[PDB]
Every structure is written in C-alpha cells, then in structure tokens.
C-alpha cells in the first residue's frame, strides 16, 4: 500500500467526482472506474438516455433496456413500495417541472402541479423479465432515477475496483463516500459527517469506518428561492411540494451505497423522529440527523462512535 494514492478527479453528473486507489500498481484502475461511471451516467440521466427512451414511449409501447437499467429500476420499485410511495421513481413529471438545482428552476403554478400528480404511481411501471422491457402504463409518465443513481454508480465503481483486486480506496461522488479497506497506517478511515449548512466538504464531526458507504443529503445545497420562500429538491409525490419538516440534513451509514441513497430520500418524508424509527428497522443501517436548529441525533448503531466537533451544533 502507498501512503500517497493514485488520484483522479472529473466533473460528472453535475458534481466533482474523485477516485483514490492506494494499491501499488493499480493506477490504470482509475480510468476503468471513471469509464464505468460515464457508462452508467449516460444510461440513466435525464439531463437521449435509456430512461429518456422509456419516458418517450409512456402509454405507447414497452422499451428494451440494458441489464444495468433494468436492475436499477427493479430496485427503485422496491424503495418506492417500502416507503409507501413517498419515494417514487415515477416522480419525473414533477421533478422535471420544478427542475430544482438547474439554472431554469421554477416554482410552477398549482394548475401545473395538479396536472402531474395523477401521473405519479410506481405501480404503473410494468416490467417484463423475459423481454427485459420497461413500460409506463399511462401517457405523460416519466421515470426519474436521480435519488438512487449516485449510490448505484458508487456500488458499481466498487465492483470494478474489486474485480481488479483493489483493496484500499476512496470513492467520492460529490461528498457521498465509500471507504474501502483501512487507512494505509492501519487505522479505520476517519469519515467526515457533512455540515448541511455549509458547502460539500465542510463537516460537523467524524466517524471511523471501514468497508462502508456514508452518503449525505441536505436541504440547503441547491434550493430555489423566490419571493422570500425556499424550495429544496426532495419533493413529496403526494402534494407536489418539497417535504416540510424538521430535517436540515441526514447522513446514512450502510454497507451498500444504493441503500443509503434510497433510504435517505425515503426518510425525508418522516421527519427526524419518524425517520429515526424507520432506520431502526433496517439491520446494518444507521443515521445521523441534523435539525434546522442545529440539533444532532444518532441512531442506536452509532452511539459512542460519532464524534461531534462543530461547537455550533449540539447532540440531542
């Protein structure tokens, strides 16, 4: 293992992506990782991808998809059902309307919202295993896989690393982290817990981890502000507006990055106390929640592990 890793940085899917590999002789795996990231991003992004092709044929015909996309949609339907539909991969018509985080983000009229709410229904995604097709049952429906895309891609990048016998690495997609192995000095990696009140990279504390995903989500990262009100990017498919509760941010610790990514989006529907109860139901998944008044909460699996360092915040 090297003390200084091989490192490469790119800007993909709207975010800074850095991969680091500490195994000597594995420098070319960085390009293999980035190749896989670019491959997947092109298939699933709606910003003509495979997801675009499914959407174009909604209510018309099933669309053939590659194995990557069939799998991601399969998993998205599970996160959708498990959340009671508060997470819904058919939220596309609504997230396309607001377009939060893009230069043309807009608060739509209530009429525009009422026109898209009847289109949101994960049960109207029809999957055919033998043909490997996806069909949206109603015209106007749109898939949006954005709430699990980065986690899935992180998991698939790790798969490439392991296929190349990488043992010790850090995968960073815009502040969402997977740490493989341990620090070359033998200690567990000290993983920052993101400060939702500051840009990605600023932290409120640290958590030692090894072979683990630590994702982060915060409502102040890319919101639209208009006429004195703010609208963040995590939308309620039952109302058409962003979730409105006490969560400012949440970090989820789990073995698989896609689980952290999907469950984070799902917990935003439940608030801090309800979201903690939800995470206490998933074995091997834990969370740090941060309220709008800078109180910090930890689920049972993290007590005594997380160290709060920012004095502007308080454990509660």
Ligand X SMILES: Nc1ncnc2c1ncn2[C@@H]1O[C@H](COP(=O)(O)OP(=O)(O)OP(=O)(O)O)[C@@H](O)[C@H]1O
Choice between 182 and 265, CB closer to ligand X: 265
Q: Is the dihedral of CA 95, 101, 104, 105 positive or negative?
A: positive
Helical segments of the chain, H only: 29-44, 50-56, 67-82, 92-98, 110-116, 146-163, 257-267, 271-279
Cα–Cα distance measured from residue 313 to residue 289, given in angstroms and rounded to the nearest whole number:
12
Residue whose CB is less far from ligand X, 168 or 218: 218
Residues near 234 by Cβ (< 8 Å), separated by ≥ 6?
A: 217, 219, 242, 243, 265, 268
**Residue 94: count of CB within 10 angstroms of its CB:** 24
Cα–Cα dist 100/241, whole Å: 11
The nearest distance, CB 126 to ligand X, in angstroms, is 19
* Only segment of 17-25, 62-70, 234-242, 277-285 that touches ligand X (CB under 6 A): 234-242
Q: Is 261 in the site for Mg ion (CB under 5 A)?
A: yes
Length of the chain, in residues: 316
Which range touches ligand X (CB under 6 A), out of 51-59, 61-69, 89-97, 295-303?
A: 89-97
Which member of 37, 141, 147, 207 binds ligand X (CB under 6 A)?
Answer: 147
- Supply the minimum distance, in Å, between the C-beta of residue 71 and ligand X: 17
Assess 250 for contact with ligand X (CB under 6 A).
no
174 contacts which partner out of Mg ion, ligand X, none, CB within 5 to 8 A by kind?
Answer: ligand X
Phi, psi of 3 (to 5 degrees): -75, -40
Determine if 265 is a binding residue for Mg ion (CB under 5 A).
Answer: yes
Q: How far is the CB of 276 from ligand X (least distance, A)?
A: 17
State in angstroms the smallest separation of the CB of 272 from ligand X.
Answer: 16
Residue of 217, 257, 291, 299 that binds Mg ion (CB under 5 A): 217
Spatial separation of the C-alpha atoms in residues 248 and 217, rounded to whole Å:
9
Binding span for Mg ion by CB under 5 A among 71-79, 212-220, 221-229, 304-312 = 212-220
Q: Is the distance from CB of 139 to CB of 60 less than 8 angstroms? A: yes
Interface segment toward ligand X; rule CB under 6 A; list 26-34, 52-60, 103-111, 141-149: 141-149
Whether the CA torsion 115, 121, 126, 129 is positive or negative: it is: positive
Query: Does the protein bind ligand X through residue 197 (CB under 6 A)?
Result: no
Q: Which residue has the tokens 């390009």?
A: 31
Nearest approach, Cβ of 81 to Mg ion (angstroms)?
A: 16
DSSP string, 246-289: SEEEEEEEESSHHHHHHHHHHHTTTHHHHHHHHHTTSTT-EEEE
Out of 41, 51, 97, 234, name the contact with ligand X by CB under 6 A: 234
95 binds ligand X (CB under 6 A): yes
Q: Shortest Cβ distance from residue 194 to Mg ion (Å)?
A: 9
Give residues 155-174 in contact with ligand X (rule: CB under 6 A): 174
Burial 268-305 (b: 16+ CB within 10 A, else e): bbbbbeebbebbeeeeebbbbbbbeebebbbbeebeee
Answer yes or no whether residue 80 interacts with Mg ion by CB under 5 A.
no
Smallest separation, CB 188 to ligand X (Å): 23
| Interface ranges with ligand X (CB under 6 A) | 87-89, 91, 95, 144, 146-147, 150, 174, 176, 217, 233-235, 237, 261, 264-265
| Interface ranges with Mg ion (CB under 5 A) | 147, 150, 176, 215, 217, 261, 264-265
């Amino acid at each position: 293992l090297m003390d200084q890793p091989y490192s490469k940085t790119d800007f993909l899917m709207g975010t800074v992506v850095t991969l680091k590999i500490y195994d000597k002789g594995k420098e070319d795996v960085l390009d293999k990782g980035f190749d896989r990231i670019k491959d997947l991003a092109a298939k699933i992004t709606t910003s003509t991808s495979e997801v675009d092709k499914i959407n174009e044929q909604a209510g018309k015909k099933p669309v053939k998809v590659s194995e990557d996309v069939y799998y991601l949609i399969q998993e998205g339907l599970k996160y959708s059902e498990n959340s009671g539909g508060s997470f819904d991969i058919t939220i596309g018509p609504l997230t396309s309307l607001w377009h939060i985080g893009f230069s043309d983000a807009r608060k739509p009229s209530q009429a525009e919202i009422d026109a898209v709410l009847p289109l949101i229904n994960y049960k109207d995604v029809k999957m055919n295993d033998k043909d490997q097709t996806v069909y949206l049952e109603k015209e106007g429906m749109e898939l949006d896989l954005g709430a699990i895309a980065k986690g899935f891609i992180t998991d698939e990048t790790l798969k490439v690393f392991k296929e190349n016998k990488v043992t010790t690495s850090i995968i960073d997609l815009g502040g969402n982290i997977y740490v493989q192995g341990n620090n070359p000095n033998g200690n567990k990696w000290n993983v920052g817990i993101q400060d939702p009140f500051s840009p990605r990279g600023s932290v409120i504390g640290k958590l030692p981890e090894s072979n683990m995903s630590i994702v982060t989500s915060g409502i102040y990262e890319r919101y639209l502000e208009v006429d004195g009100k703010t609208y963040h990017h995590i939308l309620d498919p039952k109302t058409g507006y962003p979730f409105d509760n006490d969560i400012a941010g949440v970090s989820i610790v789990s073995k698989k990055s896609i689980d952290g990514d999907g469950l984070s989006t799902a917990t935003f529907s439940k608030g801090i106390k309800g979201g903690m109860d939800y995470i206490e139901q998933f074995e091997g998944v834990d969370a740090i929640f941060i309220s709008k008044e800078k109180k910090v909460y930890e689920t049972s699996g993290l007590k005594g592990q997380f160290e709060l360092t920012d004095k502007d915040f308080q454990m509660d």
